[PDB]
Design a binder for this molecule. Sequence first.
Ligand SMILES: O=C(O)c1ccc(CN2C[C@@H]3C[C@H]2CN3Cc2ccc(Oc3ccc(-c4ncco4)cc3)cc2)cc1
Ligand SMILES: [Yb+3]
Ligand SMILES: [Yb+3]
Ligand SMILES: [Zn+2]
Length: 607
Amino acid sequence: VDTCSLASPASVCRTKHLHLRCSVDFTRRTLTGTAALTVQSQEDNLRSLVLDTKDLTIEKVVINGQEVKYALGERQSYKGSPMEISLPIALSKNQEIVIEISFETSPKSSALQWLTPEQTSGKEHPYLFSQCQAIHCRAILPCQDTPSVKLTYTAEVSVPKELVALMSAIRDGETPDPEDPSRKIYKFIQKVPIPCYLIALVVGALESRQIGPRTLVWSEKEQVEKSAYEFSETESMLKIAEDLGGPYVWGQYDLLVLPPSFPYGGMENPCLTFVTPTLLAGDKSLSNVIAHEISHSWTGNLVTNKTWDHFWLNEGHTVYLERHICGRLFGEKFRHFNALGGWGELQNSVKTFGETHPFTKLVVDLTDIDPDVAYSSVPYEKGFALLFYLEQLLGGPEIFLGFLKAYVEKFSYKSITTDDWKDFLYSYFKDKVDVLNQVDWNAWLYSPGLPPIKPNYDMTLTNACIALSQRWITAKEDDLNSFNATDLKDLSSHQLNEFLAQTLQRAPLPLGHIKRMQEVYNFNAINNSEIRFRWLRLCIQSKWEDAIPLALKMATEQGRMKFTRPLFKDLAAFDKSHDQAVRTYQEHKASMHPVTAMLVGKDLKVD
Ligand SMILES: O=C(O)c1ccc(CN2C[C@@H]3C[C@H]2CN3Cc2ccc(Oc3ccc(-c4ncco4)cc3)cc2)cc1
Ligand SMILES: [Yb+3]
Ligand SMILES: [Yb+3]
Ligand SMILES: [Zn+2]
């Protein structure tokens, strides 16, 4: 039972394939077309079925060439409206039928962001992108919007001829639209069964550059050169991921660099990973996000969470694989550095929510909870901490990686729960069950707050970060003159970021210390988004008014939620910038991504 879906469950019927034929209308801000669902009955005498929809206009439903009866139920807030379809003939078990639904999206679809030419790099063409995870696919097309169902898909997308369409699938050609010569049709094929949250579409003035044997980078022309360099390690990361998880089954691994309002660091859309342009640091330092998206090609896209309550399965194992890829490229001391940094991010999330908050549990109950509201570092970091703890308990990384590959092999093309994972862990490590029974499973999986045990971490690379952060925190006015630009000479960008994260955990610091830090280190000149974000939070929480325009500019010139949400919250919490934060949100709201707009509104208590 998936409590986030209003559709018939997988025990009643299952969508085997989607054939999508649609047209993108930038003047109306609508996607119009037909979603033809091949559905297999799982029951005898099946006469109706229910699909998820959200702000969709339904024109008609056709089965066997004839229009059928359908009804839309009352809207259930963020879940949308259930659509019940009356089948013309009762189905026996395993019988399949094709249901062609003619629909139109709303301009306010929570899955989409429609951009004006002014909101793009080129300024001459509009742009469109989707983001279906977790339950936004129902805001694009009628479907069983649950990761417990996997389907293949084909698509034909009509767009203005000057633009390019891409999807989370293999490109299958382009032609002039026969029905309209001012338009082009782009075709797509996804032969690997996927959960519908993995369906994705982008339409814009896109260009491509090859960066590897199975990888193109796509973006507007202005970003192509910088993106090709930034993500040049992609093929090397794919090779390591294949060694760790088994064959890469998806064919292509392309990257799309979105406009700055893209709400996440990345999204693992199969064949076409979507990434934020905030990764463009100029030195490949934020490449762990690519390693993370690559890892999802096994943990999440092949082995999928059965419901959103088990999302930690997707995230925890992916962070685990991501840290092994970066460890293979940069060394074991680096894997430990990132792992320890992750524990710190977990401390921050637990502190923010509170140690008894149900969103700090590894397995959550999302029945009447919007998954976008529950989203945090918890399933990533508490999930990673559990696996890292298990690796240490069970004999080390080589042994635990054997389990990871067997786990991916066992559950490929399936959707699983925490109980399925735990059962297989016990089966694989049957000769180590005495060790496994020492784990406080109830606390790890079902209890809020920090985990009951903290793993062992090598401190080699972290030591210099802690030492410099402690020098600043313990410094008095008479010690400020001792700081100098030479303090940073032996720190990598990763270490500078960690120094800032350690210091931010003890914020606020006195205003004089923050002014001195700018005087000696010139942090205002750093473009790296992670470093700049932590530095600006530190300035605002330490009440430096000079940082107000910089923080406001960062919060609005990009829309990655990891940065935008805490920046607006810190600005609303500083009396000097409170009104500015609220007014800036109000002025930008109508041109923001719909999910980001909703969440920033909730954070600021602005309805
Ligand atoms: O750095 C970054 O900015 C960054 C950000 C994002 C990404 C990738 N994403 C794509 C997008 C966000 C994440 C997953 N997608 C959305 C989503 C998925 C599931 C969900 O439902 C939940 C279920 C359980 C729990 C839960 N809470 C505690 C335990 O379990 C929490 C949410 C809600 C939203 C990569 C990088
Ligand atoms: Yb083909
Ligand atoms: Yb002193
Ligand atoms: Zn992820």
